[PDB]
Structures are given as structure tokens and as C-alpha cells.
């Protein structure tokens, strides 16, 4: 009762996107990759249960899960879109996860590749002991 704590963790969301030398057969013009990770090789697996990348429904099997790092999806396509990313925590209490709406944009041929990084900070107030220890291993 006297004590309380706030645990903060840092996540990096991002993506790379490159106009391919030659479109694929379906007419996909770009390769891209999107990811969730911790800054500077930090291990978020300690508190992250899985990451679900919700690809546009134009993609087959759009809801892509990574239970283990690297938390990423690599794909080819023709258009940027908004890509909901759900990070689930190894948690036994609210919140069990957090959602980011990730802007997966493409630039046109002629422009250098996209290399985008978006930093996110999570704050957990008075996590359970179990979870607190997980967060603080990261």
C-alpha cells in the first residue's frame, strides 16, 4: 500500500519498402517488410506473447502472427495501407495487448527506398509481480 510503481517499455515499429527491379506476375511493384522490435537489440520477448499483423484483406491469409522474434512480415504488393499491429503481452490482467495502426506507405519509383521507424512507449502502472519481472527483464 505505501509503494507503487510505473514500468515503461520502449517498442520500435517500422517498415522498409522498395520498388522492385521488375514487377511480379501479379503486378506487385514493391517488396516491403514491417516489424516490431525493441530498441538496440533489446529483448521484448520477455513480456511479448505474440504480435499479430493485420494485413489488408486484399492479401490472402491476412492475419499474420509471430509468437517468436523476429516479429515481422515480409510481403510484396502494389499499394500502401493502414496495417493494424497487435502486441499481446505475457500478462494475466488488463491490458492483455495494445494496438497500433501502422501506416505502411510506399514511395514511387524514382524515390529511394522507404526506411521508416516509429518509436512507441508503453507505461504499465502497478503491474503484477510476475509481469513486472517480465517487463524488467527487457
Amino acid at each position: 500500500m505505501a509503494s507503487s510503481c510505473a514500468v515503461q517499455v520502449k517498442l520500435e515499429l517500422g517498415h522498409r519498402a522498395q520498388v522492385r527491379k521488375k514487377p511480379t506476375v501479379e503486378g506487385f511493384t514493391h517488396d516491403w517488410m514491417v516489424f516490431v522490435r525493441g530498441p538496440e537489440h533489446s529483448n521484448i520477448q520477455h513480456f511479448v506473447e505474440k504480435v499479430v499483423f493485420h494485413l489488408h484483406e486484399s492479401f490472402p491469409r491476412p492475419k499474420r502472427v509471430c509468437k517468436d522474434p523476429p516479429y515481422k512480415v515480409e510481403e510484396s504488393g502494389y499499394a500502401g495501407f493502414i496495417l493494424p499491429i497487435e502486441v499481446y503481452f505475457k500478462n494475466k490482467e488488463e491490458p492483455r495487448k495494445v494496438r497500433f495502426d501502422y501506416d505502411l506507405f510506399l514511395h514511387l519509383e524514382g524515390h529511394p527506398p522507404v526506411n521508416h521507424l516509429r518509436c512507441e512507449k508503453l507505461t504499465f502502472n502497478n503491474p503484477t509481480e510476475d509481469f513486472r519481472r517480465k517487463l524488467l527483464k527487457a
Binding site: 522498409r16 522498395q18 517488396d31 517488410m33 499479430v52 491469409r61 491476412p62 492475419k63 499474420r64 502472427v65 509471430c66 509468437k67 512480415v73 515480409e74 529511394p112 527506398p113 526506411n115
Partner: peptide
């Protein structure tokens, strides 16, 4: 939900 394939891809920028 879909696991992703383990097919390795060349790096790109």
C-alpha cells in the same frame, strides 16, 4: 491467424 512461411528472402533497403 497464419504463421508466416520460413522461406528466406534477400535483404533490401
Amino acid at each position: 491467424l497464419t504463421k508466416p512461411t520460413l522461406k528466406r528472402k534477400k535483404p533490401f533497403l
